[PDB]
Amino acid sequence: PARVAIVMGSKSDWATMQFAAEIFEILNVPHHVEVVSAQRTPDKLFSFAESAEENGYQVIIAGAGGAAHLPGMIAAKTLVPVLGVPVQSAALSGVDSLYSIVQMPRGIPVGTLAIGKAGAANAALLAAQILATHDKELHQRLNDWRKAQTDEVLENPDPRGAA
Amino acid sequence: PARVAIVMGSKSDWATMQFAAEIFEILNVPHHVEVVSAQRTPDKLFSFAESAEENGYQVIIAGAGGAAHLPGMIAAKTLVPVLGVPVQSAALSGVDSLYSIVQMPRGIPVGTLAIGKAGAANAALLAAQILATHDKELHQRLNDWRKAQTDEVLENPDPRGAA
Amino acid sequence: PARVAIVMGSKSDWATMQFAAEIFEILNVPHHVEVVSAQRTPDKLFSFAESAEENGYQVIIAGAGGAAHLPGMIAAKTLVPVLGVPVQSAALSGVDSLYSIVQMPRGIPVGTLAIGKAGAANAALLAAQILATHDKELHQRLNDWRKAQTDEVLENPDPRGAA
Amino acid sequence: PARVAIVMGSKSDWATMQFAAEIFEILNVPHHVEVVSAQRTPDKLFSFAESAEENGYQVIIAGAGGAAHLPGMIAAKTLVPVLGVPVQSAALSGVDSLYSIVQMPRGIPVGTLAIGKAGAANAALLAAQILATHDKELHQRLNDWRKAQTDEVLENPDPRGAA
Amino acid sequence: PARVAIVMGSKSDWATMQFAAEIFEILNVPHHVEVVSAQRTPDKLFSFAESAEENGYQVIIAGAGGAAHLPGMIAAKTLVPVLGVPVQSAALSGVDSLYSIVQMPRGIPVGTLAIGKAGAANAALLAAQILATHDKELHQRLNDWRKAQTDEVLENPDPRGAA
Amino acid sequence: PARVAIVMGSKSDWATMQFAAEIFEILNVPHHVEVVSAQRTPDKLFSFAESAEENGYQVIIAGAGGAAHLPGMIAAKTLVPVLGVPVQSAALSGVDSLYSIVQMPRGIPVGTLAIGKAGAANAALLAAQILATHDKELHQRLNDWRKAQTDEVLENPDPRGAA
Amino acid sequence: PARVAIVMGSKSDWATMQFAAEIFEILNVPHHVEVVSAQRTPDKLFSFAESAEENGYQVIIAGAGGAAHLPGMIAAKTLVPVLGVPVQSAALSGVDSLYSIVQMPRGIPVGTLAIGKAGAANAALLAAQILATHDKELHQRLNDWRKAQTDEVLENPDPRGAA
Amino acid sequence: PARVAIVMGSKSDWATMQFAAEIFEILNVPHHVEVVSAQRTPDKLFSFAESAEENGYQVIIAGAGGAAHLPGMIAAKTLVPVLGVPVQSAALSGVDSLYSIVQMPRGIPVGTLAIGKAGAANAALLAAQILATHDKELHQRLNDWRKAQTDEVLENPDPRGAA
Ligand SMILES: Nc1c([N+](=O)[O-])ncn1[C@@H]1O[C@H](COP(=O)(O)O)[C@@H](O)[C@H]1O
Ligand SMILES: Nc1c([N+](=O)[O-])ncn1[C@@H]1O[C@H](COP(=O)(O)O)[C@@H](O)[C@H]1O
Ligand SMILES: Nc1c([N+](=O)[O-])ncn1[C@@H]1O[C@H](COP(=O)(O)O)[C@@H](O)[C@H]1O
Ligand SMILES: Nc1c([N+](=O)[O-])ncn1[C@@H]1O[C@H](COP(=O)(O)O)[C@@H](O)[C@H]1O
Ligand SMILES: Nc1c([N+](=O)[O-])ncn1[C@@H]1O[C@H](COP(=O)(O)O)[C@@H](O)[C@H]1O
Ligand SMILES: Nc1c([N+](=O)[O-])ncn1[C@@H]1O[C@H](COP(=O)(O)O)[C@@H](O)[C@H]1O
Ligand SMILES: Nc1c([N+](=O)[O-])ncn1[C@@H]1O[C@H](COP(=O)(O)O)[C@@H](O)[C@H]1O
Ligand SMILES: Nc1c([N+](=O)[O-])ncn1[C@@H]1O[C@H](COP(=O)(O)O)[C@@H](O)[C@H]1O
């Protein structure tokens, strides 16, 4: 069963959040994907967050741009850990998204990743690290994936064009 | 009856939001004041915003600091106009509050005022201007209040210490 | 009659402010549109703001970029509520516009929306919400428009390409 | 046994990180606390991160200020999930700390919380939420703690001085 | 006669603008000082700027804080050169003041000085440099003042406590 | 004779500073144009600033990007008034240029205009306003130019496409 | 032998760091180039920095983008002077890179250059200046290179198109 | 003889730059200290930088606040390596100082350290690292100083109050 949900405020956010989904495809981690807006579908948000525990989610990754309320509002309504991905916004280049996600007051946390597609990939990796604490197989695939990333850099030390 | 509600994410916000209440005392505008947190009391927020129309509110002023979700979440759940006051936060000096309130995406507006006590006073004045469109008496008191503010500056053109 | 005016500092601002006009076309709200510059036509600004009440305006939406003086100067000269739209500027990406509109001192408010076309659309929606407090028909169309926006997201929960 | 470590770049950071420790005292979660500097004790950092899995840690909370390398360098060396707390710095008010923690590139995540003591408390709460996925007792205490926080706001709706 | 006017949006700005007045006292340059608010006394602003030429002003120094409209609105209404002093604001530390003064669009300039009391002193010095182009005596006093400032640094090269 | 010099740190700055030159062509104001770098030609800078008075300059406009030292270093070496134009830089979008020009300490002023081509045009207009205080003909052309700009906006109040 | 190493967090950084290499080609300074990631190859970083002294390096230039840990982590592990080049990042335009490199706490320095390709070129020039203190030939080539840069500006004072 | 000079734009900067001097006292490195202002003593700056090589300096540390021109102007006039310390300014908290020092264009480098007293200490340490490349004794004292700093953290792993 899917132990992680990837949600996002808008279809346009998929350009960014697809990179979280890609990590899970690589690591063979079942996941659910859904557009849930704090602003445009507030009642669905509430029912989504209320049922997350009972639906079997152990991590929720939420992405949004601009005044990014989605991740914090999910976190207000569930004990399932929430990771937040700030989507790059046009004018403020995701600074608004970042401040509106990370600056949660005491009592209702959201673990925040980097602005944009690097943070989407990292949210899925952090979610996978969380899951891997109690899933030996996934822990192994993660270790393999990390080693592969390190080996790629190690076997290519010179960035210049071939001799 | 009270046609405006002043709400805020925390009791600590009252140091700032009191300045909105002061404007209404001056203009004799009945108002309701309440601590409503998007993060700490999400279900109350929803019921507050859902009932605002039926409770007779025509403007809601919402103040919050940090990742300020309160004003936008109220606006998502009611057609009653929402004005947002960014409370000055410790580290980011209300920049986080300002970006998290003003940068609402298309579809769910929050009219935002200045960071801190000047924005609290201005939110109440803008709310009073909105009400005064259909309240001749209040329009008159506003006009009187404005004239008094202008006259104060006009009768004191020299800022230096007396001769 | 038109109960809202949309004004802007320059013709170039129309690329942004057109999105406010679009909302009003959708909601069938009569509106006036005009280029009024605080800097290039200061005397027209003064006469525009002075006559707004007598011309029947109940909300003014003002857009400008850079050192954005237009919305605040209108507000200084009329009791008609002013909503400000920060236009995205080249170098500072509308941060200058946002600070120059939102940071009004105590006494002369401007309700500020998001930088750029999302704030233009939201200003018109907030203006329509203000008008809808005393216009049952408009209140209904707004409710319909909101429901349509929510339904669009609800009927499209999966952002991925079709099976 | 302690399933969470709280580490920080300097003794001076304890003024902030104590607030993470406080959450764990409240929730009765055993924890380890240590000063580990990426810059001043790089070899200890490496051995700390290398042994974290074998020492039984399931979450690491790392706090640092300025050019905050500690959390990301821990994360580079272990699969144990890392939460980062940006400590408020003098000149840049923790903006440097926040950017240096949150903006990790793809491959090595750090879940980041708010600048300063609110983020320290939230990191411990997020760590506790992570642990509570497989610890029914802790899940219960968390639920109790949340309810207590909500009830406090609910039973005190009026922020004004007593009648 | 006074060839320079020092104006400011509020009496509170005098704490800053006094430093412009001090330069003129030192250089024996007659000057006029007045509180003129774009926001609170818009009609006085217009009449002030309209009459400046006829009143004999050759430079106007305008100081304001927050959404600082005063200098740009003066400049819109007169050909007399306007220098703008951004007053340090509470939350944004004069960044708002600076952006709202300096970012004037093409056609209506305001020469902007540093945030706060250093910019007030510099505005008066720049105004004096402008006047000194056609006033040999003032040019001489300026030269004397500059030499005195240079000599002070030159005769005190070691910043350490006396032997 | 030329009473204004337009100088700039690099040939690449001409893309921006050309807009100052354009104003002077329009107003028929003789001007000198030169590349002078504080960093790459420090001795020329010194001799340029030292001789400016004797060469007949009454205003100097200096443009530079990045760590923009040119305007302030000219001002340190001459009593001729200096206006500074921050050129838009790649990474920081002229914010670096703006802070490095405007934030001069007490004693050595530089009147600063907007980032980029609007500030270049405005520097020339402010320089022309300075010159026009003692040049009736130029004062007249300026007045004509301003009226033309105002008339353009006035005769085009509707920004929408023709009926 | 090579007395300078140019290292960078990723192959993608070569687009920027190539400009450091170009300076060394011009000045005929032997150099080593390598991709070394603090995050993706932490153990290689440690062995690289540990052996730098013994490998004959007298300056290390390190470039990285985003949460840029590379330069500071090298500096933590060697006494060889480290110069840091902030690579321009997508969302934050190298501001993150700059803060994460320059804001090192007391005890472990990194001399930081400008964001992007200008800082890469300058790091190599500063490294060459450091080496030239004890290398008369290199000192001479540097002097020649500087003179050539100054002469280029001097022989091209007019930036306008040929007569 | 003194192989390093510590210079600063003003006596007030000594509060910060004293921390560079302290490092040199600890490491027994002879040094020269002087107030040299780019703005207030431009001719002294030029003669200082011109003679630095002949006076035996191998590193110059320059501190300044605000529009910080000193370090870059020294670097324009000498091949002796220049390290820049941004002094914390009142309004902009040393951000202006940092941008005006670090953002040097290609050709004239300044190695920049952290804002404020930590950067002053680090500039002296980086200068000492540069000198230590050819001074075995100083290299040894540096190594000793580093080890002492590491040992301090290592022997104090628990930041909490004694049992
Ligand atoms: N922040 C947010 C929420 N929310 O926080 O609930 N819902 C949509 N949004 C944001 O609106 C931004 C623009 O959405 P759209 O107008 O392109 O549909 C998206 O980045 C989306 O995440
Ligand atoms: N933003 C917010 C919300 N909310 O947006 O729903 N609830 C509380 N807060 C903010 O937490 C900040 C600190 O609250 P407290 O920890 O002092 O109770 C306050 O400014 C409050 O507005
Ligand atoms: N801010 C402003 C005012 N005003 O505040 O009165 N008038 C024009 N402007 C701004 O100049 C900016 C550029 O105008 P333009 O040079 O393209 O005509 C526009 O965004 C316009 O809103
Ligand atoms: N960032 C950092 C690291 N590190 O990232 O490894 N070690 C110490 N620091 C920071 O130096 C800052 C000042 O430390 P100190 O000079 O007061 O000991 C602290 O906030 C500490 O976290
Ligand atoms: N900006 C401005 C204008 N104006 O631009 O016309 N009038 C007052 N202000 C500003 O309100 C700020 C606070 O004023 P006050 O509320 O202390 O009277 C002052 O810095 C003043 O300059
Ligand atoms: N700031 C500056 C100085 N100076 O302040 O003396 N000289 C060149 N510069 C700047 O280098 C920037 C890039 O110059 P270049 O590398 O394209 O020649 C230009 O914007 C120029 O103004
Ligand atoms: N900062 C950093 C480190 N490090 O600090 O050790 N390693 C890679 N990076 C950065 O990841 C950024 C993107 O890398 P990549 O995802 O394109 O490979 C690069 O700018 C690189 O310098
Ligand atoms: N930046 C600068 C220069 N300069 O760059 O040549 N000279 C003085 N300053 C700065 O003026 C600031 C205030 O100086 P003062 O008005 O307190 O004497 C100081 O930080 C000093 O470094």
Domain ranges in chain E are 1-163
CB contact under 8 A, B114 and E14: no
Nearest to D126 among A105, A109, A146 (CB): A109
Nearest CA in chain G to F8: G159
Residue G115 per-residue DSSP state: S
Q: Which two tokens stand for residue C59?
A: 């909300």
Is ligand 7 within 6 A of the CB of residue G38? Answer: yes
Is residue D107 in contact with ligand 7, taking CB distance under 6 Å?
Answer: no
- Name, in order, each residue with C-beta under 8 angstroms of C60's C-beta and a sequence gap of 6 or more: C4, C5, C7, C49, C52, C74, C78, C80, C81, C82, C83
Q: Which two tokens stand for residue A43?
A: 């009642």
The residue nearest atom 9 of ligand 1, judged by CA position, is A9
Residue type present at position D73: M
Total length of chain D: 163
Closest CA to B116 of B10, B4, B18, B7: B18
Tokens standing for residue F120: 């270049």
Percent composition of chain F: helix, strand, coil (DSSP 3-state, to 5) = 50, 15, 35
Helix-then-strand count for chain G, H and E: 6, 5
CA distance A160 to F98: 37
Interhelix angle C95-102/C70-77, nearest 10 degrees: 10
- What 8-state DSSP symbol labels residue B148? H
Determine which residue's CA is closest to atom 14 belonging to ligand 4: D10
Whether A154 and G14 lie within 8 Å, measured CB to CB: no
Element at C129 (helix H, strand E):
helix C117-132
- The half-sphere exposure of A48 on its side-chain side, counting CA atoms within 13 A, is 29
Size of chain G in residues? 163
A11 contacts in C (CB within 8 Å)?
156, 159
The ligand 1 atom at the shortest distance from the C-alpha of residue A71 is: 5
Which of the 8 DSSP states describes residue D104?
Answer: P
> Among B105, B117, B97, which residue's Cα sits nearest to residue B38?
B97
Note whether B21 and B124 are within 8 A (CB): yes
Residue A130: which of D114, D130, D143 has the nearest Cβ?
A: D130
Q: By the 8 A CB rule, do H94 and H88 touch?
A: yes
**Euclidean distance between CA atoms B122 and B128, whole angstroms:** 10
User: Resolution in A, one decimal?
Assistant: 1.8
User: Is residue G111 classed as helix, strand or coil in its secondary structure?
Assistant: strand
Q: Do B116 and E90 lie within an 8 Å CB cutoff?
A: yes
Q: What is the CB-side half-sphere exposure of residue D4 using CA atoms within 13 A? A: 27
Rounded-to-integer distance, Cα E83 and Cα E53, Å:
15
Alpha carbon of C163: minimum distance to chain B alpha carbons (Å): 29
CB atoms within 10 A of CB G136: 8
Ligand 4, pocket residues at CB < 6 Å: D 9-10, 12-13, 37-40, 64-70, 87; G 105-106
- Give chain D's count of helices (H) and strands (E): 6, 5
Which segments of G103-135 does DSSP mark as H helices, in order?
Answer: 117-132
Q: In Å, what is the CA distance from F93 to each residue of A99, C48, C138, C141?
A: 21, 35, 43, 43
DSSP states of D12-54: GGHHHHHHHHHHHHHHT--EEEEE--TTT-HHHHHHHHHHTTT
Atom 8 (ligand 8): residue with closest C-alpha?
Answer: H9
Count other C-beta atoms under 10 Å from residue G133's C-beta: 21
Q: Can you tell me the distance from the alpha carbon of C83 to that of C78, in angstroms, rounded to the nearest whole number?
A: 13
- Cα–Cα distance, C10 to D133 (Å, whole number): 57
Q: Write the DSSP assignment of F80-116 as a string of letters.
A: S-EEEEEEPPTTTTTHHHHHHHH-PPTTS--EE--SS
| Helical packing angle, D95-102 and D70-77, nearest 10° | 10
Contact H92, F99 (CB under 8 A): yes
Reading phi first (left if > 0) and then psi (alpha if -120 to 50, else beta), residue E87 is in: beta
Tokens of F109: 């002023």
DSSP C57: -
The three-class DSSP label of residue C52 is: coil
Q: Name the residue with tokens 């991905």.
A: A85
Q: In testing the pocket of ligand 3, which one of C6, C7, C11, C13 has its CB within 8 Å of the most ligand atoms?
A: C13
For residues B103 and E79, the answer to whether their CB atoms sit within 8 Å is no
Distance CA(G38)–CA(C59), nearest Å, equals: 56
CB atoms < 10 A from the CB of F157, how many?
A: 14
E152 contacts in H (CB within 8 Å)?
40
Ligand with minimal distance to G108 CA = 4
From residue H47, alpha-carbon distances to C82, H43, H74 in Å are 58, 6, 10
Find chain G residues with C-beta within 8 A of A152's C-beta.
40
- Measured between beta carbons, the chain H residues lying within 8 angstroms of E158 are 33-35
Which token pair is H29? 């490195």
| Residue G5 CA to ligand 4 centre (angstroms) | 27
The closest-lying atom of ligand 8 relative to the alpha carbon of residue H97 is 1
What does CATH list as the number for F1-163? 3.40.50.1970
**Interface contact flag, A103 B38, Cβ < 8 Å:** no
Helix axis angle, G136-154 to G14-27, nearest 10°: 110
Residue D141, both tokens: 């205490």
Instruction: Judge: B67–A102 Cβ closer than 8 Å, yes or no.
Output: yes
Burial class (CB in 10 A: 0-12, 13-18, 19+), A28: exposed
Residue C152 one-letter amino acid: E
Cα D42 to Cα C33, D38, F51: the distances in Å are 64, 5, 57
3-state class (DSSP) for residue B38 = coil
Give the DSSP H/E element, type plus range, for residue G7. strand G4-8
In 3D space, the residue among H58, H59, H109, H117 whose CA is nearest the CA of residue H86 turns out to be: H117
Is E151 marked within a binding site? Answer: no
Pick from F8, B147, A145, H120: nearest CA to D109 = A145
User: What atom in ligand 6 is closest to the CA of residue F66?
Assistant: 1
Q: Give H60's strand partners.
A: H5, H82
SS3 D6: strand
Whether G10 is in the pocket of ligand 7, judged by its Cβ within 6 Å, is yes
Asked whether G3 lines ligand 7 (CB < 6 A), one says: no
Spell out which residues of chain D touch residue A122, defining contact as CB-CB under 8 Å.
104, 106-109
Chains B and G touch (3+ CB pairs under 8 A): no
- For residue A103, give how far its alpha carbon lies from the nearest alpha carbon of chain B (Å): 5
Q: What are B106's two structure tokens? A: 């298309």
Nearest to D76 by CA among D38, D40, D120, D112: D38
Q: What tokens appear for H87 in the block?
A: 């002094």
| DSSP label of C29 | -
Residue whose token pair is 């000193």: H70
**Class of residue B8 by CB neighbours under 10 A (exposed 0-12, middle 13-18, buried 19+):** buried
Structure-token pair, residue G26: 């011009």
Query: Quick one: tokens of A102?
Result: 């990370």
Question: How many CB atoms sit inside 10 A of residue H140's CB?
Answer: 11
Q: What are phi and psi of G149, to 5 degrees?
A: -65, -45
Q: CB D105 to CB G73 under 8 A? A: no
CA distance H41 to chain F (A): 8
Please state the three-class secondary structure of chain E as a single string: CCCEEEEECCHHHHHHHHHHHHHHHHHCCCEEEEECCCCCCHHHHHHHHHHCCCCCCCEEEEEEECCCCHHHHHHHHCCCCEEEEEECCCCCCCHHHHHHHHCCCCCCCCEECCCCHHHHHHHHHHHHHHHHCCCHHHHHHHHHHHHHHHHHHHCCCCCCCCC
> Hey, is G45 helix, strand or coil?
helix
C83 DSSP β-pair partners:
C61, C111
Measured in whole angstroms, the distance separating CA A32 from the mean position of its chain's CA atoms is 12
- What is the separation of C-alpha D78 from the centre of its chain, rounded to a whole number of angstroms? 16
Q: What single DSSP character describes residue H12?
A: G
Q: E77 and E60 in contact (C-beta within 8 Å)?
A: no
The H or E element containing residue B8 is strand B4-8
Distance of CA H1 to the CA centre of its chain: 18
Question: Two tokens at G114?
Answer: 């400008």
Structure tokens at E61: 């120094």
C-alpha span between B48 and F36 (Å, rounded): 65
Interface contact B65-A105, CB threshold 8 A:
yes
Q: Which helix (H) or strand (E) holds F64?
A: strand F59-65
Mutate to test the interface with A, among D26, D122, D153 (most CBs of A within 10 A): D122
> How far is residue D100 CA from its own chain's centroid?
16
Cα–Cα distance list, C119 to C19, C94, D122, H36 (Å): 9, 11, 32, 50
Torsion angle, alpha carbons of D102, A68, B69, B66, to 10: 30
A43 contacts: CB under 8 Å, gap ≥ 6: none
Containing D61, the helix (H) or strand (E) segment is strand D59-65
B40 marked as part of a ligand binding site: yes
Residue B140, phi-psi category: left (phi > 0), alpha (psi -120 to 50), beta (remainder): alpha
Q: Comparing C-alpha atoms, which of E66, C110, C81, E46 is closest to residue B142? A: C81
Select from E121, E148, H151, A125 the least CA-distant residue to D79.
A125
DSSP-based three-state secondary structure for C87:
strand
**From the CB coordinates, do chains A and D have 3 or more pairs under 8 Å?**
yes
Q: Which of F57, F59, F36 is nearest to F46 (CA)?
A: F36
Helix axes E136-154, E14-27, angle to 10 degrees: 110
Tell me which residue of B150, E17, F36 sits closest to G153, measured CA to CA: F36
Tell me if there are at least 3 CB pairs under 8 Å linking chains H and G: yes
Cα–Cα distance measured from residue E88 to residue E13, given in angstroms and rounded to the nearest whole number: 9
Helix (H) or strand (E) holding C130: helix C117-132
> Which one of the ligands is nearest to B89 CA?
2
The span from the CA of H81 to the CA of H99, in Å, is 19
Residue H10 CA to its chain's centroid (Å): 15
On the CB side of G139, CA atoms within 13 Å amount to: 12
Q: Residue-wise over F43-81: b if at least 16 C-beta within 10 A, else e?
A: ebbbebbeebeeeebbbbbbbbbbbbbbbbbbbbbbbbb
Q: Does the distance separating the beta carbons of H108 and G122 come in below 8 Å?
A: yes
In G25-102, beta strands by DSSP E: 31-35, 59-65, 82-87
Q: Which of C110, C131, C132 is nearest to C119 (CA)?
A: C110
Q: What DSSP line would sit under A7-71, residue for residue?
A: EES-GGGHHHHHHHHHHHHHHT--EEEEE--TTT-HHHHHHHHHHTTTTT-SEEEEEEESS--HH
Those residues whose C-beta lies under 8 Å from the C-beta of residue H12, and which sit 6 or more positions away, are none
| Closest to G121 measured CA to CA, from G21, G12, G6 | G21
Facing residues of D32 across strands? D5
The rounded Cα B101 to chain-centroid distance in angstroms is 12
Backbone angles phi, psi at B91, to 5 degrees: -70, -45
Helix boundaries (H) for chain H: 14-27, 42-51, 70-77, 95-102, 117-132, 136-154
Q: Which of C68, C93, C67 is nearest to C82 (CA)?
A: C68
Sequence length of chain H is 163
CA A160 to chain G, closest CA, distance in angstroms equals 8
Query: Please, which residues bridge with residue F111 across strands?
Result: F83
Chain-centre distance for alpha carbon F38: 17
Residue A53 is which amino acid?
E
CA atoms within 13 A on the CB side of G130: 32
Q: Is the dihedral of CA E65, F149, C83, A93 positive or negative?
A: negative
Nearest to H7 by CA among H27, H142, G102, H16: H16
- Whether G23 contacts G146, CB under 8 Å: no
Pick from H46, H73, H92: CB nearest F103: H92
Pick from G10, G70, G73 the residue to mutate for testing the D interface (most D CBs within 10 Å): G73
Determine the residue of chain C that is closest to A35 in CA distance: C157
How was this structure obtained? Answer: X-ray
The residue assigned the tokens 């469109």 is B133
| 8 A C-beta contact, residue G125 and residue F122 | no
Neighbours of chain D (3+ CB pairs under 8 A): A, B, G, H
Residues of H with CB under 8 A from a CB of F: 9-10, 38-40, 42, 46, 65-69, 72-73, 75-77, 89, 92, 95-96, 99-105, 107-108
User: Cα dihedral sign for F119, F123, F129, F130?
Assistant: positive
Cβ density class A96-129: b for 16+ within 10 Å, e for less? bbbbbbbbbbbbbbbbbbbbbbbbbbbbbbbbbb
Token pair of D101, please?
Answer: 């923690």
CA distance H107 to C83: 49
The upper half-sphere exposure of residue C83, i.e. CA atoms within 13 Å in the direction of its Cβ, equals: 36
β-sheet bridge partners, residue D60: D5, D82
Distance CA B156, CA B150 (A): 10
- Cβ–ligand 1 contact at A12 (below 6 Å): yes
Q: Which residues of H touch E114 (CB under 8 A)?
A: 66-67
Residue stretches of the annotated binding site of D: 10, 13, 40
**Residue F48 in contact with residue H82, Cβ under 8 Å?**
no
Instruction: Give the closest residue to B114 by CA, choosing from C125, C112, E87.
Output: C112
Question: Of C21, A37, G23, nearest to H109 (Cα)?
Answer: G23
Interface of H with E (CB under 8 A): 8, 10-11, 13-14, 17, 33-37, 40-41, 44, 66-67, 90-93
